[PDB]
């Protein structure tokens, strides 16, 4: 599909002089994978920020980054004040929730309802992070939504963001079944997925012990996906954890039930594909 | 209180050319408590079974030691032929359900209801694995009970099983107020809590982060016992394990609700209790 056609800003590599490590907005966090992987790839985070409205979420964040996490309510609350007074930034991510961007709705609202125009709010503070003509400051930014969106309003995302969305799938990489479009401007954008040995692809490596995978990988008939003791039972939520590149019992954080740690789990990233994503970071970047 | 008397036995201490791994019967296993401990201490364990009826016990089980466990049901289906079909025993362990012994119930039923004459079920499983006389092998059996008992429960436990009960503090070595009756023939039955500086012994280092304890400990007014961002929060669950001695994330091993993790954490052992117990074990049997 070539409907636009704009080529894409390719940044200088900087040396290790003059290396400096990262100021990262984070719009719709949810739970804390990019600061994650972030951490799990080794780079100096000097700042992050997430604006995020739902109390679970930030009791994630708050137990498993202890504090780094300067948070913000809501992103109407944020004007371009306060990210011109929060220093210029230098990696600006998230994923608008997609509950009306979905064709999965047979009723849906389209774009421009209160769940989908967020993705403007986000395009708005694109605009206010985004530094000036003249500036040779390395600037990177990625949007993440659902493969399950219509032609126009992939082709109004594409046209706004003016970026080529690139399609990555979960099973490529892990044991989930989700294709996602990523907009941004990274280096290797649409490069191939580089399946690390380390990352289980399979599904029976995230389970635990006494259960056997019925299918090869899960999905986002009247059965369950896994066998355990000759009787189909539901899917774990440490096990969800570890299909989605996840650590080991990551969102057990507060007296939540089963159902909020599946509303947390659905909405979050694939924790291998941003690691395949924010790979090329490090060399633009400070290593620890 | 000098009601009945009697000598606990001593065995003599086998070097270590004769020395051999554990059998462990674990009679009212629930959170498998004593084969962590056991682990923990670095023993070598040759067979651990355990006679649970609690399918959430049993999956904690099946999680936490992958198959190790041999799984009886309900104890009353265990017979004399089942105790001397799978070997002889040498660590009998166990702790009634204290619906009915407790003395917090106002209407309480009493020893002798059904979830306290289960006892009595220990006390034919203390039966049939004794051995016989003629038999010098090291033997050794542990009970454990609530403090909230009458005086004349007490002294027919204490009559039945031939054994001075130790009264053990969890405060003396955690962070939890709770007193429990130990009956058993373990060396150093009364021994005074060796406080390991490992073990968390306040309040503080079990929260997590974010989280500032109100009380220097916690119980087993309308209020609650941390503060979390200047605001009255529930104890978390993973908090109540670091608080019991659990490893970090320990009962989450299903889709199970708060209050079932709850209900699994509050008639579970204190693990460094039970470590304090265990701790003579290891000049008695096998080490790894
Ligand atoms: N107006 C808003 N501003 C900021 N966050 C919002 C918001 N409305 C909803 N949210 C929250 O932000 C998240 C966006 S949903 C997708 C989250 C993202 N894919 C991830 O990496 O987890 C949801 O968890 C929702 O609870
Ligand atoms: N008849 C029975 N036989 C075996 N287990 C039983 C039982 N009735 C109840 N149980 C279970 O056995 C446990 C006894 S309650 C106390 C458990 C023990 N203090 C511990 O170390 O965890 C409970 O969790 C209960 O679910």
Redesign the pocket.
Known sequence: HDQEFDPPKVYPPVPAEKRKPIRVLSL????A?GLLVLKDLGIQVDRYIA????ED?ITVGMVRHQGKIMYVG???SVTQKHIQEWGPFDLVIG?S?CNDLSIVNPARKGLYEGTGR?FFEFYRLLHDARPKEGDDRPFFWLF?NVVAMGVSDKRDISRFLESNPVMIDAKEVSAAHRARYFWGNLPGMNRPLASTVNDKLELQECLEHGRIAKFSKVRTDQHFPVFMNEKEDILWCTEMERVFGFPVHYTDVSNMSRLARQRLLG???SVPVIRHLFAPLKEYFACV
Do not use: A
Request: net charge negative.
């Open positions: 719709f966090d949810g739970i994978t604006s995020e409205v739902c979420s809501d992103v109407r994923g929730p967020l993440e909405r979050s990233w």
